[PDB]
């Protein structure tokens, strides 16, 4: 059945609750972002209306083939009505099109649903600050102190640097990036930027990127591999065996590959794995809050209830996160 943590109490709304068939007493459904944990169940003939950002809707429309009529896009940083409830979508600083949602219930209660997000101080200078928020549905993906990774700013600076090095050194060398779902585009876009390349890819992915309407995207991407000296390949293809296969299958224009895996302490001290003329790099590009980013965020927010939405399936997990919420409540004095 649909769990209590996917339901907005007060309304008949749900958030990312498409894998449960029809939820009883659910007048509208909300999609925070286009990630498959969060959209599973959305067939092209899903018959209830869906509320989301523009971008998430494009991806629904084109990848999952749902009809304009059942797809209600909504602008960011704007007060909107939906089944007579005030709602606002805020940028989640997650993947393209991802949003947090504020529900302003008619009784007076105000609910933030982070969805997936990467807490940032800039969110404290937002619509959020214009009132107290009582309940918080919290992306707790990394709610544990060992989870510390650097700023996206650092990683990309590094990856830009590692890139401009290897190509200025060997101008017949190819940067490659790993990828599966949307997100982490700034990695591969920022390298292409600095080497004045376009970004080559398979068509599914090219299509996926055309949904996101990035400024001047046509001039930053392509499906003809040859012309692009930075290529995106599926994450599974990012191994020495796969990168040989790829370098044969270009017609011998590139003699050396610099790869990147974006999934997973100091950044300058990072060292690759080299086997041949193939350097692979594991880089920690998160689009989720670290322990401290989250902490700061919630401690600023000072919510009354907090409802975690992630690592929710076991009691060890549930009570460990509840301990950290107690610590934060106490430390900040709310
Ligand atoms: C092939 O599958 N890939 C993995 C794997 O988990 N790789 C990376 C890893 O640890 N990752 C993490 C994360 O760290 O949370 C994540 C992020 S969790 C997540 N984030 C979302 O934004 C979202 O919408 N849904 N989810 C679930 C999943 S893959 C990546 C794998 C399987 S076996 C193996 N060696 N790794
Ligand atoms: Ni996500």
Curated annotation (Swiss-Prot):
A GO term for molecular function: zinc ion binding
GO cellular component terms, A-Z: fibrillar center; nucleoplasm
Cell compartment(s), UniProt: Nucleus
Induction / repression: During mitosis. The mRNA encoding this protein contains an internal ribosome entry site (IRES) in its 5'-UTR. This 5'-UTR generally suppresses translation while specifically promoting expression during mitosis, when cap-dependent translation may be impaired.
Superkingdom in the source lineage: Eukaryota
Chloroplast found in the keyword field: no
Keyword GTP-binding among UniProt keywords: no
Substitution effect: residue 288 to A: Impaired nuclear focus formation, reduced interaction with PIAS and increased sensitivity to cisplatin
Gene Ontology biological process: cell division; double-strand break repair via nonhomologous end joining; interstrand cross-link repair
Effect of residue 139 to N: Impaired nuclear focus formation, reduced interaction with PIAS and increased sensitivity to cisplatin
Tissue distribution: Expressed in brain, heart, kidney, liver, pancreas, placenta and skeletal muscle.
Keywords: Cell cycle, Cell division, DNA damage, DNA repair, Hydrolase, Isopeptide bond, Metal-binding, Mitosis, Nucleus, Phosphoprotein, Ubl conjugation, Zinc, Zinc-finger
Residues in coiled coil: none
Family: Belongs to the DNA repair metallo-beta-lactamase (DRMBL) family.
Function: May be required for DNA interstrand cross-link repair. Also required for checkpoint mediated cell cycle arrest in early prophase in response to mitotic spindle poisons. Possesses beta-lactamase activity, catalyzing the hydrolysis of penicillin G and nitrocefin. Exhibits no activity towards other beta-lactam antibiotic classes including cephalosporins (cefotaxime) and carbapenems (imipenem).
Quaternary structure and interacting proteins, as annotated: Binds constitutively to TP53BP1. Binds CDC27, which is itself a component of the anaphase promoting complex (APC). Binds PIAS1.
Protein name: DNA cross-link repair 1A protein
Species annotation: Homo sapiens (Human)
Annotated gene: DCLRE1A
Full-protein positions shown: 700 to 1040 of 1040
